[PDB]
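Bench log, entry 3. Co-assembly request; chain sequences pasted below exactly as received.
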Amino acid sequence: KALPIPEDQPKKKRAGRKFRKYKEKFRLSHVRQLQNRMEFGKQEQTVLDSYGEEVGLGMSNTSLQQAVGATSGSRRSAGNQAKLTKVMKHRISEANQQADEFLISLGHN
Amino acid sequence: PSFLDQEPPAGYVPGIGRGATGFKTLELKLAQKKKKRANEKSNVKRQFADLKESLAAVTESEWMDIPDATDFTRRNKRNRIQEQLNRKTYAAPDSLIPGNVDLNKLTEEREKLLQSQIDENLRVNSLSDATLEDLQKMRTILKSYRKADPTNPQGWIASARLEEKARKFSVAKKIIENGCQPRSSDIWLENIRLHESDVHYCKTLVATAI
Amino acid sequence: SVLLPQLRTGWHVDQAIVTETKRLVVIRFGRKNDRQCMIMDELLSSIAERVRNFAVIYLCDIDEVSDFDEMYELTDPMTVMFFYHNKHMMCDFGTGNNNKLNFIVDDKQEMIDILETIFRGARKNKGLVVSPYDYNHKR
Amino acid sequence: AWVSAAHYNRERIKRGAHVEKTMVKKNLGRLTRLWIKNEQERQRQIQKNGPEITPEEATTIFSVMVEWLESRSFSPIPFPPLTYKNDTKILVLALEDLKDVYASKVRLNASEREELALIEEAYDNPHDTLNRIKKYLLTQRVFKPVDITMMENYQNISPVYSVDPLEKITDAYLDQYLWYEADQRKLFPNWIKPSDSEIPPLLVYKWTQGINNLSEIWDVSRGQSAVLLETTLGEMAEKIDFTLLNRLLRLIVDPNIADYITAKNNVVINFKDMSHVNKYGLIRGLKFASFIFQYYGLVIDLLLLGQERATDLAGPANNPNEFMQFKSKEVEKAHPIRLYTRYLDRIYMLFHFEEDEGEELTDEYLAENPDPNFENSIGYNNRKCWPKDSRMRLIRQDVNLGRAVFWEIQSRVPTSLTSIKWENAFVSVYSKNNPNLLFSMCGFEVRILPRQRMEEVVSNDEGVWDLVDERTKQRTAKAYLKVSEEEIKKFDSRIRGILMASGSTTFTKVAAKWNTSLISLFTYFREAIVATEPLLDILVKGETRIQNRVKLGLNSKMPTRFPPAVFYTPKELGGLGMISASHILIPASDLSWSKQTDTGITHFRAGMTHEDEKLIPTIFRYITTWENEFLDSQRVWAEYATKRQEAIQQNRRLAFEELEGSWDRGIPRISTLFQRDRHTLAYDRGHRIRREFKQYSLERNSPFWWTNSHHDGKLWNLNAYRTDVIQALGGIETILEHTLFKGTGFNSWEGLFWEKASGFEDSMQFKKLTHAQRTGLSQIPNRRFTLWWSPTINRANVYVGFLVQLDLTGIFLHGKIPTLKISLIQIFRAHLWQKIHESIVFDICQILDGELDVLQIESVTKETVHPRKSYKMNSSAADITMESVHEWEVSKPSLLHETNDSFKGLITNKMWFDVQLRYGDYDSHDISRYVRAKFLDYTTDNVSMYPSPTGVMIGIDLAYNMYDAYGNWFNGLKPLIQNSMRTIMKANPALYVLRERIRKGLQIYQSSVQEPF
RNA sequence: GGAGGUCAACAUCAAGAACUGUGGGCGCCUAUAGAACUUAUAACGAACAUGGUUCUUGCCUUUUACCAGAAC
RNA sequence: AUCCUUAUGCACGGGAAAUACGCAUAUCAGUGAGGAUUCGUCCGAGAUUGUGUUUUUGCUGGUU
RNA sequence: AAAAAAUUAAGGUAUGUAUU
Ligand SMILES: *OP(=O)(O)OP(=O)(O)OC[C@H]1O[C@@H](N2CN(C)c3c2[nH]c(N(C)C)nc3=O)[C@H](O)[C@@H]1O
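Structure output for the full assembly:
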């Protein structure tokens, strides 16, 4: 089965309310862009990862939040939030529903 | 591949037609010399060859009726599923910047929720400490605030308290003493708690507000 | 190997370059017995199907047709030479000869990128392209 | 061919011989296929022959546990009740420990997202998820197939098991429950230990101190001896057999769980096309696996010691002993075994013999294995590491004790459980004949000498510890350390991995690896690295290998030198930031730095100060030795205890101000006492074991497996190193000269930021792209690191070779440098180089053309330009021609910012100008010399065309924004041109094209407010 | 016939005892080929250079360059 | 005549998802697809196989 | 009257149109 072609196709645009909502998954949000800013001539804030490798979180805090080390809630973009696949979504609910039946038995027995 | 079939040229040179661009006694003696040197100076097939003779027997009908394309691992199906699984990616959510998590908020926030459900049924140690340059920034701003009001100790205790969290010790304890200079109760209250450690000093501080 | 067809006269070479308007024409110049001209003959044959939509492949032997030896200057076991609209294409693999190809490429994937790169750059009339991976060290 | 060639290449890569990038990738696959074939063969033959444990064998095993638990008075662990106090605390722990894998990621794999979403729902519906878990523990006994992948450590190819995520959550919950309840009921005694309280190198300290403290081990006055054992229990997990396992778990737990644990290990394991059910072994990819391994180890270790001795080591259930102690000296001296520990597999046993007891054990072995040829010492394993003087001596008396003692212990443990062989076991003896007691814990090789027998030759070492008896309080022994010959070969392989794994990565990613790997290595082995000669040699070799990788990408040919500033400047100033272990010369020629002020152009060189030269500081200072840390903690902890007493004694709580003095001190560290989440971390237990077993569940090399910084705190601070390295290269100023920073046009660097190239690569992978597009975008972060350091990399000194010119520019290239040919060719497009010249010419006309009057000038005429003049170098011609009302008073040709000017020298007519454009290197960024030399050559050059022999060249550096002019002077020029050039260079449109066009290439920016307007 | 031929062509080329095969002459003798053992590789040349392969040391992991050991 | 129930069709208004939705001169399939089990029994419709698109389908508007 | 050398080379081709 054959690779399509490497020729480029003119870029098409649309964006409604609906298509913004879907795309929001696939773009680095605001807060996440500020990690790509590295402020020059001074060391990054880094927090070590579970693994212990340090994760630089660049400008994601304001220079007054560094010095007090507050960290910033800022604005949290709900749009990307991870959500279940279709297959997986019922297997949880179905498991849960079946489980409730089980508990009742022990409730009455 | 239609041309592949045809077989005939004009009596034609290859380079020219396309429009191409490029980007005897001694001999005899040499040959003789070479000869004067030649004079002086597989396994796999053997292993198999013996089988190949074995084949000769097989009939032409059987050669035809040979099954043609048998897959036994279902490679195609697995490969397609793998491509589908690996296609796109996704961006990781913004809850995941590593700074925020405190367990104690987390358990208290949760356990309560769990309890409610039941009823219905019925700083980070990772983080690097403040850089000197950045801390300096804070100091300037707080100094400006303090200068803006020589009164209003609300800006005085902040310079003690904000400073205290970031650094504390020598600095804050000197400021809380400086801005203490009579009326405000709040400054006095602040001063004793940070400054006091020792009882005599605490007492002396108390003699201030009183 | 029997997958990929062979070109038995220099007149089969030239028509084959002309008649394919829309795709690369890739040719391996080298002779059956060679150690390295057998290896490439594999790495191409595996790839030829995947790429049928933008590239066409053929096989030629220096001994079968020696007409082309001086003009393109062919030395060593084999040379891979890319053609699009009769225009000899050209790429720098970091190896120090921008014409053709010599060394044996290692992965199937890194071979498909090079074909794809050449085609894409070529489509725009560009005469040089850059191989993303530069095997000067390799060869 | 396929099988043999697969083994043959593997040993080649074990060696560090170079086999190419592609082969190493394929070889892992082939080895994984062979290992799975062997696993499939191991299991098919346990169908035929049945379980190997034999009923008679089993009773002996099972009986030991039954007595132990009853002796110890052990209540079994119940089933987790529907209403349970800690369900919250144990979910949060368990889910966050599943969560933290994804905390480093900007982007998620499609599966990763599924698991992430699943945890969220767990927090959102805690009541609902707990019930689901409980019901699956009660009933689900069929599970979804597990998948296998293989790590390559380049040495040991290991399995990695990926489970399904709904089943992960019960397993995590279950694992957390079992560890919390287990250690709350005191199942596992002192001696099983990759335990919570101690970091592995702290454990090695405790063990050697415990060895010292036991009374009179040292005195060989009366034929006494002593022995250690190190035995890999061999296949353990791979031999665990279930029909026994179910029974043993029933013993310590309620069946409903035990049944689940036994069932979860069947599964059906897929690797690509192959599939086999796991009947026999234990799968170690499951969360509770850690607990099972410790329980099976506790079976084995009641065989070795026996109940009689094991109660001596452990102690009564009312007052269990600390790690190495007993109650009385009498209880110590009862049995030959004195100390015992087990770390996962490996066992350590110390034995104390006296000839009376000693001769017996020797003789019995001899009788049952007679050796007339004295062949015992053929197959005996020394520690290779140490010199002949220090190893094990091979003497008949002692070589028989080792083989006697080991042969005793093979006898205790039946071959069904495990496989203990001689080969994998090392034995040491301390007797009259052998002064040295040798063992390896973790990857430490230790020897001990007592001060008693020191006389046999010694040289002190960096790793030395002095060991103190609690009574004498003196120094009766010493300890030398060395890094095991394993853990050195891990490193060598891991570094090759960096250079192998990357066909294309950045320069920054590579030097980011080499930090993490080196930093792990130093922190673990602190003292020892300085004592190991081959390891040190590799570190020096490693660093250059990385550098050579960098250099080859930058240019094919290789340079005589690359300044040390490139590699060792920190990430922010635009360097790789890589740390250094080695000696590196910062040549004093490269410290030179020049700045411009409206007064003039000042230079700085500290080269003329002749003292010790400047060297790039190295890690060996910055990390304190392991000794000092424990020596502090004892005192630190005591101080803390005292302080705790003191506040409540006054009815007051501890103030930070007291302990603000010591935070970073003490191995747990004080900070963790005052961490906010400490309240709920007390329910997370067995954490040290999990981290060791995170190997198996997932594919990342986790160089820090020996710490949770949540429990331990932060164990090293390399902040001090960052500043020091900047200072060694001479401050930010000396650095930036080597950069294009001055050709950006910024005055100062306070408000500036970089746009990182890491996340830059992310925005480009959210589009649909082919592979060839996809690789093309991984090079872009390399192309920025050339410009920013382009002025040093392009110089005559570095690349020798022959100069060439960009086709419409005055920039020369020493090499090919394929990525700096491109970036420059864009930075000047549409004949930008010419335009700059013309703009500057315009400025000087419209400066002078207005000023005909004041300077008394009869004409100002900007001449024709042969289009190619601007960029070509060798010959020049005049541009702007000046005239006079009468004539002029010239001076001695001189430089702009000079003061002393006398015009009496000549009286002559008319003037010309050249505005000359240079883009300089680091070698000469001073135009002063250049301008004057060019002027002199041009005035006296025959080919050069000038109206008069009176003129003023104007040199300009586009690179550093430097300017100067060497003039023939008249009243009202110097005071004019100086004021003009300030407004010329800080205005023109042609320059403001470059300086904006360049600061795209570097992706430097300015900001005040981030928040979108 | 003889010496010498800075003339060529064609064969061989360390020595020795012992085994097998072929040919010639009257079991013996002579010649040629193969295998084994010894001498010391007393040297066909009191001289000694380059290259290929396979291994082992250094390497930019590249050469129409090499470092210095091994065997063929 | 009002009222009420189920199915199907067009439809205002409100949500969720596109790793999802289909297609086949193609194999079987309540004459039992595919699962669960406390081991006594219990649910009952799709599973293979090849393929098309899937960070997007059509359509407008601004600003340069 | 205190001291300079003993290391070499390829991996460096701008397309593209027009004229010959
Ligand atoms: O609505 P309309 O008056 O047009 O109905 P029709 O004229 O079509 O005629 C006869 C049908 O009337 C219905 N009715 C009318 N009434 C008053 C009535 C009807 N049906 C019942 N039941 C059968 C319970 N009860 C009534 O009081 C019927 O459909 C007649 O067929």
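The longest strand of chain A covers residues 37-39. Residues 1, 12, 14, 19, 22-23, 25-27, 83, 85-87 of chain A lie near RNA strand F (CB under 10 Å from a C1').
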